[PDB]
Amino acid sequence: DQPLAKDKVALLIGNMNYREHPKLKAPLVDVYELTNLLRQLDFKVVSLLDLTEYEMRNAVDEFLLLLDKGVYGLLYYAGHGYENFGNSFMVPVDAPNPYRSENCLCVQNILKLMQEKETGLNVFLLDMCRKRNDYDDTIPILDKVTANIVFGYATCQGAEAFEIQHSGLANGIFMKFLKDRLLEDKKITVLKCHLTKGKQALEIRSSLSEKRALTDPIQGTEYSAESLVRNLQWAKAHELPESMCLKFDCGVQIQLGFAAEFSNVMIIYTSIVYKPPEIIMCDAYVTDFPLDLDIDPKDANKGTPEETGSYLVSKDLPKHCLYTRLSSLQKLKEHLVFTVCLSYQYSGLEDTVEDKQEVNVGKPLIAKLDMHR
Ligand SMILES: C[C@@]1(C(F)(F)F)CN(C(=O)Nc2cnc(-n3nccn3)c(Cl)c2)c2cnc3cc(Cl)nn3c21
Ligand SMILES: [Ca+2]
Ligand SMILES: [Ca+2]
Ligand SMILES: [Ca+2]
Numbered sequence: 001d002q003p004l005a006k007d008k009v010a011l012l013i014g015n016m017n018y019r020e021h022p023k024l025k026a027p028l029v030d031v032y033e034l035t036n037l038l039r040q041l042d043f044k045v046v047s048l049l050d051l052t053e054y055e056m057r058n059a060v061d062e063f064l065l066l067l068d069k070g071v072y073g074l075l076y077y078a079g080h081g082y083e084n085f086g087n088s089f090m091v092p093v094d095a096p097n098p099y100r101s102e103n104c105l106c107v108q109n110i111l112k113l114m115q116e117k118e119t120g121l122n123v124f125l126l127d128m129c130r131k132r133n134d135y136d137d138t139i140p141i142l143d144k145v146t147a148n149i150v151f152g153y154a155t156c157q158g159a160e161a162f163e164i165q166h167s168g169l170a171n172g173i174f175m176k177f178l179k180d181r182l183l184e185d186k187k188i189t190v191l192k193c194h195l196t197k198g199k200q201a202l203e204i205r206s207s208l209s210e211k212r213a214l215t216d217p218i219q220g221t222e223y224s225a226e227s228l229v230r231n232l233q234w235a236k237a238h239e240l241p242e243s244m245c246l247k248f249d250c251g252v253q254i255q256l257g258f259a260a261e262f263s264n265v266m267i268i269y270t271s272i273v274y275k276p277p278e279i280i281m282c283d284a285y286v287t288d289f290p291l292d293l294d295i296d297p298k299d300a301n302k303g304t305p306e307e308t309g310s311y312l313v314s315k316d317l318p319k320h321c322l323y324t325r326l327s328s329l330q331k332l333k334e335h336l337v338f339t340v341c342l343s344y345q346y347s348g349l350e351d352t353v354e355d356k357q358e359v360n361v362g363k364p365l366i367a368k369l370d371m372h373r
């Protein structure tokens with residue numbers, strides 16, 4: 001018969017800003033573009049950048065809690081990894097140098113937890129940068145039947161070769177794999193990666209009792225409290241604050257708008273939307289962000305979103321603003337309180353008047369979970 005999904009859930013993790021290890025760049029683009037693909041296939045997606053051990057374990061555990069009988073679950077990791085005695089590990093951004101298994105999340109344990117579910121399809125995809133000389137070890141096989149599983153594991157030896165092979169947009173190995181191997185053609189309307197130098201590997205392994213695809217329909221409910229819970233739990237972790245018109249005392253109106261780039265990355269943007277006739281010149285800027293978010297002012301207040309480090313290009317956002325990228329939202333302890341400043345001059349005068357308003361926007365996106373240490 002036709003295979004159906006009970007639900008479609010996905011978790012995508014991209015680690016880049018490593019403290020004790022060389023920084024990567026590729027994950028950002030590949031997480032974003034895979035998120036966009038899966039979203040069009042009717043997955044609810046969580047997409048997280050730059051996670052610590054604690055954050056990664058909470059994220060993966062709560063993903064595994066969503067896997068139940070019939071559920072289609074996809075997990076993706078990109079960033080540094082390591083291998084020891086058949087066991088592979090995903091390295092968080094706070095990991096010490098050298099790597100230790102206590103600090104890292106083990107791949108095989110996640111694989112064993114996923115196959116202990118009666119899911120309709122498990123997909124686990126790893127796009128690891130390895131250390132240069134970290135090849136696969138000599139092992140016995142000591143310790144994949146009824147579970148439907150697709151396991152994909154890509155490696156490049158060294159950050160150089162990793163970033164080289166991942167150069168380009170749209171060209172992710174697993175995005176290509178999913179589009180070619182896991183999508184049935186006419187069921188959906190969806191909107192070269194040359195082999196580069198160095199040492200690389202790809203392994204793909206599958207065990208399926210019947211044909212399964214990411215395009216398989218969700219078994220739809222009209223009156224399920226479980227469907228409601230599932231949808232609402234995800235959706236309330238993805239609320240943006242509404243656009244604000246900030247009216248200053250002198251009559252200047254600044255509009256403040258918001259965009260989601262990841263579940264833990266929000267773009268904010270400002271524009272003047274009314275200047276009164278008394279005032280000849282004005283400008284506005286944002287400052288005073290919570291220290292937990294770690295905002296560098298040099299990546300704030302920029303006149304294109306591209307300059308903040310965003311994926312979002314000048315076509316994707318309202319034009320003619322100053323843009324600021326607020327990453328690390330999972331670290332927010334209290335409320336995202338910040339300050340919008342206005343500088344203005346009265347008609348004909350050299351005198352610049354400064355003014356400011358404090359904005360509270362609550363706990364946007366994944367910050368709503370309030371799950372910090
Ligand atoms: C239910 C959630 C939610 F995000 F939608 F609410 C919960 N969850 C999390 O990732 N949760 C999470 C918890 N704590 C932390 N954290 N931040 C600081 C300290 N601990 C972080 Cl980063 C993440 C996942 C993961 N994958 C999926 C896929 C779908 Cl669908 N939902 N989903 C979820
Ligand atoms: Ca649809
Ligand atoms: Ca530990
Ligand atoms: Ca090894």
Ligand SMILES: [Ca+2]
Pocket residue numbers: 026029030166167168169170171172
């Ligand atoms: Ca790429």
Ligand SMILES: [Ca+2]
Pocket residue numbers: 222
């Ligand atoms: Ca019915």
Ligand SMILES: [Ca+2]
Pocket residue numbers: 333334370
């Ligand atoms: Ca708190």
Ligand SMILES: [Ca+2]
Pocket residue numbers: 351352353354
């Ligand atoms: Ca003055």
